[PDB]
Structure formats: structure tokens, C-alpha cells
Design a protein around this ligand. Structure first.
Ligand SMILES: Cc1nc([C@H]2CCCNC2)[nH]c1C(=O)Nc1ccccn1
Lengths: 39, 156
């Protein structure tokens, strides 16, 4: 049986850890909600 | 029950100890999360009960107590913040510039951050702190890393 616990506020935080790239990927979305790489 | 606006952990006492299965957003009296996290099942908030109201497996979304309330969208140019809520760890903002998922039905923003499976449902925010979508439904690229879509629902 599932339950919820508050983890904090939704706020934009200045000076946060900036990381991660921005790829342009070719994908397909199936009926079950699964994304996949189209090549 | 606790209906305070904010980010929440979705926990289960079914497996060994308490295990975090996902994350969700409370806004305007509605709980927003990903379908694969709860599989439509009812939630407990202290002693209060949250019952599902809307859901869709293809979109991989589900709302509780009311219709989907989140309607902000990524502008296509600005950096965004993933408010990652990882299992057993504190909520942590991480700024990234999203990529693009090119599909036959249109383009979708995508955040290239790698976090445990229990982080599914963590909100992605714009400069004013508005939720532009949820992190948790994506794909694994060539180098084994994880790239999630910026999944946003429709507001009626
Ligand atoms: C358990 C699981 N199940 C799905 C599926 C949801 C519906 C169809 N499409 C994939 N993603 C996952 C997952 O592990 N997501 C995730 C989210 C953040 C970080 C790492 N993994």
C-alpha cells in the first residue's frame, strides 16, 4: 500500500548545480508509453 | 490529509522496509505523478485517502483528487531545473538545457540527467518556478545514460 511524504517546495533556485548536455534524438512512442531510438 | 502545495515522495511498505517508488507534485488540491509509479492505485496521506481521477498509460501520467492542473510549457530556448527527489536523499535542484525528442507527432523537450528509478515523477521547472512537466519517461542512449522527456499533461 502506497503513501506520500512531503519533500519540499517548488521553487527556482539561483546558483544551482548546472550540468548535463542537450541531445537531438530520433524517437518513437509506442501504445504502452515506451520511448525508443529510431535509426 | 496533507494537501499542501509542493514536491512529494511516493513510498511503499509492500517491499522490504519503506521503499521510494516515485515522486509527485501537489498543486491546487491535485496530486500529479507518473502512471508507472502508482499503476493507478490509491494513495495515503497521513490518514487521508487520495483516489485517482485521470490517467493515461501512453502519456504515462495520473492525477489524484482532480483533473490535471499543470499547464506551463518549456519555451524551447531557456535552461530549466529538475527538482530531483532521490531515494533516501534530500530534494536537490539541477539546472540543465534540454535537448529534443524528434517524434512523428511533434518535438518534445528532453532532460539528459541520470538518477535512480525512484526519482520518476520529479518536476521540471521554468525561471518563475512553474512546473513545465515531469521527469521519468524516457530512453537509454548508446553510452548507457538516461534521457527523459519533459512530460506535460493537458489542462481542461
Ligand atoms: C520503472 C520504469 N518504468 C518506466 C516506463 C514507464 C511507462 C513506459 N515507459 C517506461 N520507466 C521507468 C524508469 O525506471 N524511469 C526512470 C526515471 C528516472 C530515472 C530513471 N528511470
Amino acid at each position: 500500500d502506497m503513501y506520500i511524504e512531503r519533500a519540499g517546495d517548488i521553487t527556482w533556485e539561483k546558483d544551482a548545480e548546472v550540468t548535463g548536455n542537450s541531445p537531438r534524438l530520433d524517437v518513437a512512442l509506442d501504445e504502452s508509453g515506451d520511448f525508443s531510438l529510431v535509426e | 490529509g496533507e494537501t499542501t502545495d509542493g514536491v512529494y515522495r511516493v513510498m511503499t511498505r509492500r517491499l522490504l522496509g519503506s521503499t521510494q517508488v516515485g515522486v509527485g507534485v501537489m498543486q491546487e488540491g491535485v496530486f500529479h505523478t507518473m502512471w508507472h509509479v502508482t499503476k493507478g492505485a490509491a494513495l495515503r496521506s497521513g490518514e487521508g485517502r487520495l483516489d485517482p481521477y485521470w490517467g493515461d498509460v501512453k502519456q504515462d501520467l495520473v492525477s489524484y483528487c482532480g483533473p490535471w492542473k499543470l499547464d506551463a510549457a518549456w519555451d524551447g530556448l531557456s535552461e530549466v531545473q529538475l527538482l530531483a527527489v532521490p531515494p533516501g536523499e534530500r530534494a536537490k535542484n539541477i539546472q540543465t538545457l534540454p535537448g529534443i525528442f524528434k517524434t512523428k507527432d511533434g518535438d518534445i523537450g528532453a532532460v539528459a540527467l541520470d538518477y535512480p528509478a525512484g526519482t520518476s515523477g520529479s518536476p521540471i521547472l521554468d525561471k518563475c518556478g512553474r512546473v513545465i512537466g515531469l521527469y521519468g519517461n524516457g530512453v537509454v542512449i548508446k553510452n548507457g545514460s538516461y534521457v527523459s522527456a519533459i512530460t506535460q499533461g493537458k489542462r481542461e
